[PDB]
């Protein structure tokens, strides 16, 4: 319900009733080498359950509240990294990117935790990339404050591969759809080889998303990709 | 006015009141060597003035008349090829592939001109690709009749690069935007290079569309592309 979701999300944003979940992202050659943990937002509904980002993000956007989540989540993430030595990754939404106020606030916050710059990567989903202009300032600002930037769910937008060279990303997360059952339909290899060849040529490591299978894993590994992540390595779970 | 166009096209379509224009498609490494000529449709209006396909095609679509153009153009093109020995290229519209009747008529026509098979390439623009099934049903069909198929305005669907080898297409015409001012905007090279790497591996020659500039030509040529077309080599003109 537009107003069930509306009361719930507004209250949740205000009391900061969001939980941090994590999923390990690991080296392809060694699934015991942890590259970072990808932070996932979980919503606490009063009638019990933990609700996944996938279920609530759609409404956050419909209400234009996404930037609030972003702020909340970044403050929480930075806070919680004080407890360990692990590298983390977290999304930024197009909404934050579009509001100069929100975006400044974010830089404000990063400047306050400059110590953590080398342990937190910020991520944008392909489906909400801003202009290459915006991406360029974004990385300049971030690099100055010691933080790295990455892109994810790539790439329907593969034609921008060369634009990315000038951005010095930490890595590129490939949409899992491009590796789904790859071991089973070698059809999909040509495209992956292309990304892998191009990206390697500008020193940008590739991470394969949503790997569900040993078969999928063994081909990704073999084609020479750097990282993997997915249900093969477990459900997203609270800090451990 | 939407009204004026309805009557013009229906009338001109009925009267077969169209002119074939041509634009040469030429080797990247020798712009004097003509790979083939692309047939361009030109509407004659009431005063004998020509209207380019670019302007009138959107209306054939709205009025659902593209299959009419297709049949009329195909017949004329097959007719005029009898007067020379040059190779030609001609678009089929999605509307035809989707109309089983129109499509069989197209096959009946082709079948009636087996002898021209090796000199006529049919083209589908990327914007109007049918589903993979239709593409392959179409490829086996033309093949048995001697005719070959190609794709144009390509680049946005590079992720389908793996599905292309089983088609034995004649060539891939790369959409001009991936080429535009490539000599200034060198961001564009990595994508092109990637397309050319995959195209080499499936033995599918590339042709760059709408090349306007010696700088573009020079870059395209250096990257190994087979062919080029565009205003650099002159405007579209009647056979003469
Ligand atoms: N089919 C399949 N799915 C898998 C597999 N492995 C993990 N997943 C799921 O797909 C999403 C993966 O995380 P993500 O790539 O960061 O994708 C994320 C991320 O891009 C975004 N998101 C999550 N948290 C935040 C946040 O705090 N802020 C922003 N702006 N976006 C967020 O929404 C997505 C999260 O949705 P989730 O519901 O948490 O769902 C997660 C996860 O539950 C797999 O092997 N197969
Ligand atoms: N800016 C720029 N433009 C250039 C350049 N070189 C050529 N052009 C123009 O772009 C189009 C090129 O032909 P096309 O790629 O086959 O693209 C064609 C073709 O796909 C299609 N078309 C034309 N005739 C037919 C037809 O008889 N049947 C069907 N189904 N489609 C047709 O519509 C397009 C033709 O529209 P046109 O008005 O003829 O416009 C032509 C041409 O005038 C350049 O260097 N720069």
Residue numbers in the entry:
A (entry chain B), B (entry chain A): 409 to 648
Study text:
The crystal structure of LapDEAL bound to c-di-GMP (residues 399–648; LapDEAL•c-di-GMP) was solved by molecular replacement using the EAL domain from apo-LapDdual as the search model. We obtained crystals in two independent conditions, yielding two different crystal forms (space group C2221, two molecules per asymmetric unit; and space group P6522, one molecule per asymmetric unit). While the majority of the crystal packing contacts were different, both crystal forms maintained a common dimer of EAL domains, and the resulting structures superimposed almost perfectly (rmsd of 0.6 Å over all atoms). The crystal structure of dimeric, c-di-GMP-bound EAL domains provides insight into the conformational changes resulting from dinucleotide binding. c-di-GMP binding did not alter the overall conformation of the EAL domain observed in the apo-LapDdual structure (rmsd of 0.6 Å over all atoms), consistent with the lack of major conformational changes upon dinucleotide binding to the EAL domains of YkuI, TDB1265, and FimX. Minor changes in the dinucleotide-binding pocket are confined to four c-di-GMP-coordinating residues that adopt an alternate side chain rotamer conformation. The most notable conformational change in LapDEAL upon c-di-GMP binding occurs in the switch loop. In contrast, the switch loop adopts a conformation in the c-di-GMP-bound structure positioning F566 so that it can participate in homodimerization. Most importantly, dimerization of the c-di-GMP-bound EAL domains is incompatible with the conformation observed in the crystals of apo-LapDdual. The surface occupied by the S helix overlaps significantly with the homodimerization interface, which indicates that dinucleotide-induced conformational changes will include the displacement of the GGDEF domain and the S helix.
